[PDB]
Design a protein around this ligand. Structure first.
Ligand code: FAD
Ligand SMILES: *[C@@H]1O[C@H](CO)[C@@H](O[C@@H]2O[C@H](CO)[C@@H](O[C@@H]3O[C@H](CO)[C@@H](O)[C@H](O)[C@@H]3O)[C@H](O)[C@H]2NC(C)=O)[C@H](O)[C@H]1NC(C)=O
Ligand code: SLX
Ligand code: NAG
Ligand code: MG
Length: 495
């Protein structure tokens, strides 16, 4: 039995499947499901849930599962857009990493070791508690897990200054298919490259990341201002925004959340400056006076405060609450990367479509800055110089709106089709943290498909990784030749 192996090896925190609706099993299962779309009774459920409390327990958990016929599923923060950390078409064991949430800050080296169950919020909180002059570049959502996020890159409000989370990883502990405990030196440079953006659930189980902490001023300046406007003005704002955003010096970021409802358009402008408010306002007065920002819009605060504020949290303390409900809605999302400026009519049509579906919203980010100075092959995320914007389309709904699911998904499909001519093409680019199964998927139990796995997987592989796809395959073959870590879009090993 799996349990007997786990016990012989000192892993005690485990719970087998139970039909009891409010069993402990179900409590643990649902605790970290961050997309309600995959919560219902018709979804696949794990045969057991294991909560390892140490790297040794993680190693032995993997070793035991292998003595059986199980598919391994790793979950850190549970934010997978496609629920790939807690679903599987084959019988599976869920390894939940929530107990591995220790952050160890070394102020003498200005680095940190971060267990992979730690959320972004927990990490940010730990950093701000330790120092007023250090921060880290990662995503905007505080409940996202470092396990999946850093594995896939990790883009956020300081990426124009410092790049992705993965661009600032200097060591890691990877537990491989045989339970080996491997640091950077042990896994080798190809594998250490692959894990820094090559996607979660593919290489082994990351136990911990070693990150370089980055300088921040004791006071940064942010704004969070929602413009309530009509479509003509919203269109001209977004059309100018794209140029301001990509062209801003690296010490500034201007991003947008947007939506609409008939004649009313809302654009939430999210601003960040690595410095004081005089310089911040001088810059936006010059470059984007159309925003109509006023002195009272600019707030000076600590870096930690700024990340809580930009995400709409009440306090810095809230960063440290991994179970704080950030957004309890089922959702589907798609993303585009661009290479050419978007014409005005693209924003106009996007806004028209938003006005017809108030449950939809967009998130807009400029690249440029440091993102253009990092080589396309420095880490697996290839969208560097030449990449102008990242454009996210989201539709989300609560339980009372479930009847409209098909309609919501149809709306999103049509938005993505509308944007096709304006965004990257040949191929249409994507981002592995924004995993999208519409691109297709591999059934690893299907021999004819597996025989041709490399060609088949190119569909999504090249969209996520472009020319880096080849090295990823070589790295996969080195570290997981038997494909113990797999999912519908995992990098294939060579046969
Ligand atoms: C829900 C959500 C996601 C967001 C949000 N904001 C983002 C942002 O501002 N920038 C971004 O770059 N991404 C943002 N995303 C998307 C997330 O980045 C991705 O959804 C992350 O991959 C999520 O990571 P995590 O929360 O850990 O999700 P899981 O579902 O647990 O795992 C994803 C994937 O990775 C594997 N995996 C988890 N843990 C490990 C370890 N330790 N080792 C190897 N592999 C691991 C899983 O098996 C799965 O395959 C904002 C919001 C609200
Ligand atoms: C396996 O891991 C789970 C998840 O961490 C463990 O459950 C957790 O146990 C801790 C310690 O008992 C709980 O801490 C306390 O919770 C109570 C409220 O219920 C509170 O009074 C204390 O101040 C503290 O918060 C924690 O709630 C709980 N977490 C969850 C989500 O259940 C569990 O102990 C482990 N199981 C085994 C067999 O080791
Ligand atoms: C399920 O509900 C949500 C889903 C998602 C987000 C927020 C939600 O509430 C965030 C919103 C957001 C805001 C600003 C960003 O850059 C500054 C950004 O990249 C994102 C990304 N997305 C990822 C999808
Ligand atoms: C394998 O996959 C192919 C292509 O998706 C499918 O047509 C076929 O039915 C599958 N074969 C088996 C035996 O499952
Ligand atoms: Mg009961």
């Amino acid at each position: 039995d799996l349990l007997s192996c786990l016990t012989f090896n000192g892993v005690r925190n485990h719970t087998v499947f139970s039909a009891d609706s409010d069993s402990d099993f179900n409590r643990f299962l649902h605790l970290s499901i961050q997309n309600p779309l995959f919560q219902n009774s018709l979804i696949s459920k794990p045969s057991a849930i294991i909560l390892p409390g140490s790297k040794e327990e993680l190693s032995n958990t993997i070793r035991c599962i292998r003595k059986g016929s199980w598919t391994i599923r790793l979950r850190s923060g549970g934010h997978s857009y496609e629920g790939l950390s807690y679903t599987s078409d084959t019988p599976f064991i869920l390894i939940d990493l929530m107990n591995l949430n220790r952050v160890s800050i070394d102020l003498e080296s200005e680095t940190a070791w971060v267990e992979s169950g730690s959320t972004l919020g927990e990490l940010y909180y730990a950093i701000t508690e330790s120092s007023s002059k250090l921060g880290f570049t990662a995503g905007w959502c505080p409940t996202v897990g470092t396990g999946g996020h850093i594995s896939g890159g990790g883009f956020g409000m300081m990426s124009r200054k410092y790049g992705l989370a993965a661009d600032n990883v200097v060591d890691a502990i990877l537990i491989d298919a045989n339970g080996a405990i491997l640091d950077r030196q042990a896994m080798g440079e190809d594998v250490f490259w692959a894990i820094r953006g090559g996607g979660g659930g593919v290489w082994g189980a990351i136990y911990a990341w070693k990150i370089k902490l980055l300088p921040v001023p004791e006071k940064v300046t942010v704004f969070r201002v929602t413009k309530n406007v009509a479509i003509d003005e919203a269109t001209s704002l977004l059309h100018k925004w794209q140029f301001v955003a990509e062209e801003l010096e690296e010490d500034f970021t201007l991003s947008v959340l947007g939506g609409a409802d008939e004649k009313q358009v809302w654009l939430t402008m999210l601003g960040f400056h690595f410095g004081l408010k005089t310089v911040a306002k001088s810059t936006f007065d010059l470059l984007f006076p159309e925003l109509g920002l006023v002195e009272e819009d600019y707030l000076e605060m600590s870096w930690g405060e700024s990340f809580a504020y930009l995400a709409g949290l009440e306090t810095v303390s809230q960063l440290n609450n991994r179970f704080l409900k950030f957004d309890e809605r089922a959702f589907k999302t798609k993303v585009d990367l661009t290479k050419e400026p978007l014409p005005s009519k693209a924003f106009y049509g996007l806004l028209e479509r938003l006005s017809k579906e108030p449950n939809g919203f967009i998130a807009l980010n400029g690249f440029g800055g440091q993102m253009s100075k990092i080589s396309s092959d420095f880490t697996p995320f290839p969208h560097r110089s030449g990449t102008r914007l990242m454009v996210e389309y989201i539709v989300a709904w609560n339980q009372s709106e479930q009847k409209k699911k098909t309609e919501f998904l149809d709306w999103l499909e049509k938005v993505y089709e509308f944007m096709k001519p304006f965004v990257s093409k040949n191929p249409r680019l994507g981002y592995v943290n924004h995993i999208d199964l519409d691109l297709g998927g591999i059934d690893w139990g299907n021999k004819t498909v597996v025989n041709n796995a490399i060609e088949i997987s190119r569909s999504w592989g090249e969209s996520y990784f472009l020319s880096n796809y080849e090295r990823l395959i070589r790295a996969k073959t080195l570290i997981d030749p038997n494909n113990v870590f797999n999912h519908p879009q995992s990098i294939p090993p060579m046969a």
